[PDB]
Write a protein that binds this ligand. Structure first.
Ligand SMILES: CC(=O)N[C@@H]1[C@@H](O)[C@H](O[C@@H]2O[C@H](CO)[C@H](O)[C@H](O[C@]3(C(=O)O)C[C@H](O)[C@@H](NC(C)=O)[C@H]([C@H](O)[C@H](O)CO)O3)[C@H]2O)[C@@H](CO)O[C@H]1O
Ligand SMILES: CC(=O)N[C@@H]1[C@@H](O)[C@H](O[C@@H]2O[C@H](CO)[C@H](O)[C@H](O[C@]3(C(=O)O)C[C@H](O)[C@@H](NC(C)=O)[C@H]([C@H](O)[C@H](O)CO)O3)[C@H]2O)[C@@H](CO)O[C@H]1O
Lengths: 247, 237, 287, 39, 247, 287, 237, 39, 49
């Protein structure tokens, strides 16, 4: 016969191994394939679709109220309207999004993100806002004069209802990672803030409080690595009916 | 140019002067079942114009506290016109759908509706281990209402519902949404009375609001089956 | 539109823009299309030859992992006076009992795949040594005839596939082919699997691989032992269709998508994301 | 694969084909870069 | 030597495995093959042969009486004569047939079935019957006006003694399956009913009650998958003489 | 008439028919031929390219399964005062003791095949550990000289084939060739295997593979154990002839086809199929 | 055309004007043993016409309560004519068989007989573990009767007996059945006195019935050995 | 097959030849489609 | 029936075509509005929204 010897690792069961194994039903003929709409081959395809950010994640905001940010006609100038923490690997407005959920099945990420906001006030309502992305290093800006120094887009409300703020991949390292420390130099992405560029202005019969819906998605220069169990789901008991599967 | 549109099928036509382009679910278009994917061997009936036309359902009223509405297909149409008759007389059916949701208001009104076509939208019940019953699911032409739109009544989320074919009706922008749906199933045909391929959901993510004259603002749904085929002829159920 | 992608896309350097009629940063979410604004159009970029790979996110790899789908412990002993799994058990196969695997599969509407099954057995004395028992796992089609006793003649397995293995051997393993009567399994099913109205909702029997009947072949020993059998499933040769919103509310049952939510955020019915003091409060702000 | 049934083979991790547009841009009329989406 | 490692599955005994194994008798020369009539290579060949359906499976009908359906001269019109449940995977008139018995060694099936009825009355007896196949969905038809709307064949008694009703494969899914639930959407095939189209008419000296023998078989578009132990045979004790094989 | 079939036949579309002298739906069962009416002739059909495979019904696969053919448990101990299998047993090979395998083989009149034999051993203490015993299975031709004791010199197996295996090893396995003195085994034999008139009916000795003598090689231990040996047989390189009516009545003996039937339907002598109220009563009718 | 038939072998001939085509078991036809399949090396005797001819057995009466009849081959002919003599003087024999079953009645009679040739029809005994005895099996020219035709007296079923070469005699259609049987065995030749290759079974699935003049309705069996060969000559047994 | 005796080899699941007519139509004169079987 | 859904907007007018749908080549007047050769059918208008 052939002289052989077993190596360390022999007999182990690695859940990520990749080998062929004995067919349970020999000569089985699987059902013919049929074209079905919406085939997905790489999860990166899924995260490129923008989904709603839960920006209004505050006590008092229930359900869908958490998915929209209300802006009102201001009495003062250059007013700060809201900010958004950016770690798509930690809990916050970005966690329950397509890009956030899928990314949390991984540990490393790289690539540009895009935030699109749709103004949902009445047609007669006008306004200009400034959306700013501040690369990491310091404290989140609280004044427009400071935020304005970072990456930004000035948005004019009009027929085209939505604006896109690109959060370009700006990192020293090829990838950023999750390690449960939001202030780590390899995790913190920086901040996104929104201020009135001018003001929300509406006539008497239009609502003077309008909502914005913010969306986020990854661009095609995105990459995810090192798969891990998602922290967004868990169980401490058997699900109802699980034990009945044995009866 | 991409704001005006006319849809014409059979003896029915619809126009909108405030559209937002239109969606072709997963970039596909309805088509008849090809011989290389067919299973049922009896010659199918393809009624064409008597079934592939727009059916307008009863309207619903968009109120300040509305949670959203849904209509399952083909259930919503299983008892309407010749489409309904073919469905009742045949064990098997197959078709795509052209969906047009309508809602107009005023330049002083605000509001945003997510109009999404969900494939296999299996509903969940709230705070109980008992599965939803037949009457909780089969609402027919009247459609149903969302109990917790925030989680799409299935424990997931409306925030990520944009992963499904959809459009929005943002009052300051447009007054209609259009989605073309191809046959969506793991089988080439199906029994229309016990399985719904698609669920049309219309949910107000941004509530209706204004400070002008208050008026009833309806939401209307018109649906046109496309490339209808029926097999397994017998008596009506 | 379809193409072969092996790495993340490169970035091209961009210059200053000041063109009338051209507004790449403006979009119309109402169309249903995701923003097509490119980084090069939003800011001035440099050229970057991106070599980052995209293979770890291939669906085959994303779902290609052996995940626990069944865990059953029973008493191996003389069951003369037992009310109870008497040296064997039957398990109706399902992928809805363990949440990590369930949530991932539920990220898709339809799935077509072959399933590699691995069976791991463990024993504990109820001390004088651990016996190297022989077990038999017989595949019995969905709703088919299962054994009622450890020594039933049903175990003769004339046609059913059976695998005999020892606790001292590596875990048993075999592949169940994609066996659905349709072209793909329905991860979700918005219908009733029966012609009457009292059937179960959301359960298409066509998506139940079948029954797994496991027994200890050895007759009982003079003392009792606790035997635990763990079954793992790894899908391969995968095709997936129509991605879906990820599950947020804790699962309640293996038979449906019923929800309740946690008692307090995160993942509570009225608040999926944990709260912050206000929309201008920056959590983890760098001090 | 030394087994006779092809479904017994090891994983197939070589399908790098993609078409995100079926999810990101399922609009009937393609949107041109820079041009106003609504016209 | 060759470095190797054992994989999960090593050492197991899978009853459906397929490998070569040590020859017990080396250099053994098997008896030369001889042509023998009736070789069968695929079980599908066997199920294409029609066999008798036990349609009269009722209390009071004993033995062969269960294999024939008696029809009599009617006094009323459009009379229902009999119906036949169609799940070739459950107990009923179709279970103990060639197609039924072999199919029950499998779990999935697809293809057209054919039912042939032979009229066994006297030559002087005449009549017309209508055989109907009703695809699933509702309750079994009880009137000819309803049954007639499905797939059917009107049979005229004459020199050619038999008629064939084809039960075409009409299913949404590629295959139907057994799961012990006769009302499952993936199992129920529908119904077959038989009514007088006109009436059985015979002269004074011919018997006024005649029998039909129904047969069923699969066509060559049939397919069976997922082998399983047959529910039609079982044992709870050792057969007589089994233990004597050890003495 | 003979041809290569790899998939179920396709269906061709058909049109309306109204031709005199042409009646495809009429047949004559009296000829002995099965109806040749095609679906295309009975109804209007569409075209269907059928890709359904037919390999799982190949005879090689249908019978190609390792089925239990023998199960024997005996006491392994000091048999000083035993009346009883004293640390060994002899089994006259036969495929008529376990019904699942028997019924399948009996679906054919003649069968030619090689037989893969697998032997599985299990032990139980009559607790302080399970011994890893060595067993010997010796093939002794039909009617030949078998050992009378565990330590008989007959076990020297000078010419008989013997296989020695340990309980800790995977089940032993070897292939017995098609060894019949004829071109095929007779699953059924309508005759007497002797020149006189008192011989046994239906038993052709030419169809008895032989004797299997199994012993524990180890001398007895200070305590007793129950040892069970299970033998499985898988036919391969199969050729089959003349299919037959499937067995319906429960088996009564391994030596004949004697029948009695169950006490009540189904499968009772006067009623194979379970009863329904009447020929117009539809069981499982959809309400 | 396929309703009339004449069979001629040796000095015997039979005609029928109400046949139903005829069956060639498994699509084969009798033939002499070829050199490449032969085992016994002595030169065989091939008597031809003295043995390959029709032998008509005693008739049986079809009664309203009949259960069926059977005849085993070659046993039924082992003591008839020159076929019987060759069988008694030779240790080995080989042959095919041409079977013709006859039964005529009236245009007012009804009844259906299954005429099937069963290979290796090993009988079982009812309600006992004791195997059938020599006299239960070897009936010779008289043949035997079925105790439980419903299960073919072997625990299987007559319902599936159509898997074997057969024809039917349905009185309103035909008055005879014809089946050609080739040598059927696992050996090229056999000892004729202890093994029966085929069993001819005639079973009334539909009982004989009429309301006209009652008459004795017989069933007659004529069998012609074909391509007879005998080896191992010695004295008569 | 590394064994010297061919009967030791693994199964042979490649014989797709069939001839149902030996069981379904063992009549001496072939039956034509559509034509009355008895003439 | 045959219809057109009209959305008010810049284009102020909508056209409903009443296609010639008749069994006979021509329809006629005979002072009987319910005659099979005279009745054209009906036109109705409802709020869509
Ligand atoms: C105290 C304070 O200043 N602010 C809290 C804020 O921290 C709290 O947020 C929660 O904080 C925890 C850290 O303690 C986690 O980050 C929670 O997030 C996740 C996680 O990422 O781990 C999200 C995930 O989806 C959750 N999973 C499941 C299966 O339910 C987990 C999970 O609950 C924890 O791991 C529990 O073990 O949490 C994050 O929300 C909010 C709550 O309103 O309140 C502030 O006051
Ligand atoms: C109560 C009623 O309305 N009608 C009964 C009718 O249900 C009954 O039929 C029997 O019902 C059982 C279900 O309880 C099975 O379906 C029986 O069928 C088979 C089976 O498919 O499982 C057939 C098979 O051949 C049998 N096997 C053997 C080895 O004998 C098995 C077997 O007996 C069972 O599994 C027992 O465990 O049954 C079916 O006949 C009839 C009886 O006359 O009576 C009605 O009243």
């Amino acid at each position: 016969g052939v002289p052989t010897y077993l190596l360390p690792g022999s007999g182990q069961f690695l859940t990520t191994d990749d080998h062929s194994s004995a067919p349970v039903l020999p000569c089985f003929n699987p059902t013919p394939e049929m074209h079905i709409p919406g085939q997905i081959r790489n999860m990166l395809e899924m995260i490129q679709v923008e989904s709603m950010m839960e920006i209004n994640n505050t006590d008092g905001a229930n359900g869908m109220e958490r998915l929209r940010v209300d802006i009102s006609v201001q009495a003062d100038l250059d007013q700060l309207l809201f900010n958004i923490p950016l770690d798509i690997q930690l809990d916050g407005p970005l966690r329950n999004t397509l890009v956030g959920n899928i990314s949390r099945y991984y540990t490393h990420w790289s690539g540009s993100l895009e935030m699109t906001f749709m103004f949902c006030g009445s047609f007669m309502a006008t306004g200009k806002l400034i959306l700013c992305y501040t690369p990491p290093g310091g404290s989140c800006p609280t004044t427009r004069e400071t935020a304005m120094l970072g990456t930004h887009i000035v948005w004019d409300f009009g027929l085209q209802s939505s604006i896109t703020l690109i959060i370009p991949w700006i990192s020293g390292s090829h990838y950023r990672m999750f390690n449960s420390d939001a202030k780590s130099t390899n995790a913190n992405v920086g901040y996104v803030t929104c201020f009135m560029q001018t003001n929300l202005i509406v006539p008497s019969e239009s609502s003077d409080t309008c909502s914005l819906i913010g969306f986020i998605a990854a661009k095609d220069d995105f990459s995810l690595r090192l798969m891990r169990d998602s922290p967004d789901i868990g169980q401490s008991n058997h699900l109802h009916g699980a034990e009945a599967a044995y009866q | 140019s991409d704001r005006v549109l006319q849809l014409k099928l059979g003896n029915s036509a619809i126009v909108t002067q405030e559209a937002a382009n239109y969606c072709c679910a997963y970039g596909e278009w309805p088509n008849y079942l090809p011989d290389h994917e067919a299973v049922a061997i009896d010659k199918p009936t393809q009624p064409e114009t008597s079934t592939d036309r727009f059916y307008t359902l009863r309207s619903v009223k968009w109120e300040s506290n509305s949670t959203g509405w849904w209509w399952k297909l083909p259930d919503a149409l299983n008892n309407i016109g010749m489409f309904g008759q073919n469905v009742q007389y045949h064990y098997l059916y197959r078709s795509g759908f052209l969906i047009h949701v309508q809602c107009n208001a005023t330049k002083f009104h605000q509001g945003a509706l997510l109009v999404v076509a969900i494939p296999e939208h299996q509903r969940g019940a709230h705070d109980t281990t008992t599965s939803p019953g037949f009457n909780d699911i089969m609402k027919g032409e009247r459609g149903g209402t969302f109990n917790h739109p925030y989680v799409l009544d299935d424990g997931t989320s409306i925030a990520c519902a944009t992963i499904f074919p959809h459009q929005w009706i943002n009052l300051r922008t447009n007054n209609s949404a259009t989605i073309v749906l191809p046959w969506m199933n793991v089988a080439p045909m199906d029994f229309p009375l016990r399985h719904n391929q698609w669920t049309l959901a219309v949910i107000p993510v941004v509530p209706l609001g204004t400070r002008t004259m208050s008026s009833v603002v309806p939401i209307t749904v018109s649906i046109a089956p496309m490339c209808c085929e029926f097999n397994g002829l017998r008596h009506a159920i | 539109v379809e193409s072969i992608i092996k790495t993340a896309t490169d970035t091209v350097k961009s210059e200053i823009n000041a063109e009338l009629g051209v507004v790449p940063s403006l979009n119309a979410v109402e169309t249903g299309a995701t923003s097509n604004t490119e980084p090069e159009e939003a800011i001035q970029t440099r050229t970057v030859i991106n070599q980052h790979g995209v293979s770890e996110t291939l669906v085959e790899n994303f779902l290609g992992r052996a995940a626990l789908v069944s865990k059953k412990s029973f008493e191996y002993k003389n069951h003369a006076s037992s009310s109870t799994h008497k040296n064997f058990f039957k398990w109706t196969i399902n992928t809805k009992s363990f949440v990590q695997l369930r949530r991932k599969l539920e990220l898709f509407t339809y799935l077509r795949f072959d399933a590699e099954i691995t069976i791991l057995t463990t024993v504990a004395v109820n001390y004088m040594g651990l016996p190297d028992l022989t077990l038999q796992a017989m595949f019995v089609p969905t709703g088919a005839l299962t054994p009622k006793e450890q020594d039933s003649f049903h175990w003769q397995s004339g046609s059913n596939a059976s695998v005999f293995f020892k606790i001292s051997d590596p875990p048993a393993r075999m592949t169940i082919p994609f066996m659905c009567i349709n072209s793909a399994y329905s991860v979700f099913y918005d219908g009733f699997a029966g012609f009457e109205k009292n059937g179960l909702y959301g359960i298409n029997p066509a998506d139940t691989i079948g029954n797994l009947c496991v027994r200890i072949v050895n007759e009982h020993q003079p003392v009792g032992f606790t035997v635990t059998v763990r079954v793992y499933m790894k899908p391969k040769h995968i095709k997936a269709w129509a991605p879906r919103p990820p599950r947020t509310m804790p699962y309640m049952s293996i038979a449906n998508a019923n929800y309740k939510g946690r008692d307090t955020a995160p993942n509570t019915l009225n608040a999926i994301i944990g709260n912050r003091a206000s929309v201008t409060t920056m959590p983890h702000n760098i001090v | 694969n030394f087994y006779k049934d092809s479904y017994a083979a090891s994983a197939s991790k070589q399908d790098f084909s993609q078409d995100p547009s079926k999810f990101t841009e399922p609009v009937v009329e393609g949107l041109k870069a820079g041009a106003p989406v609504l016209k």
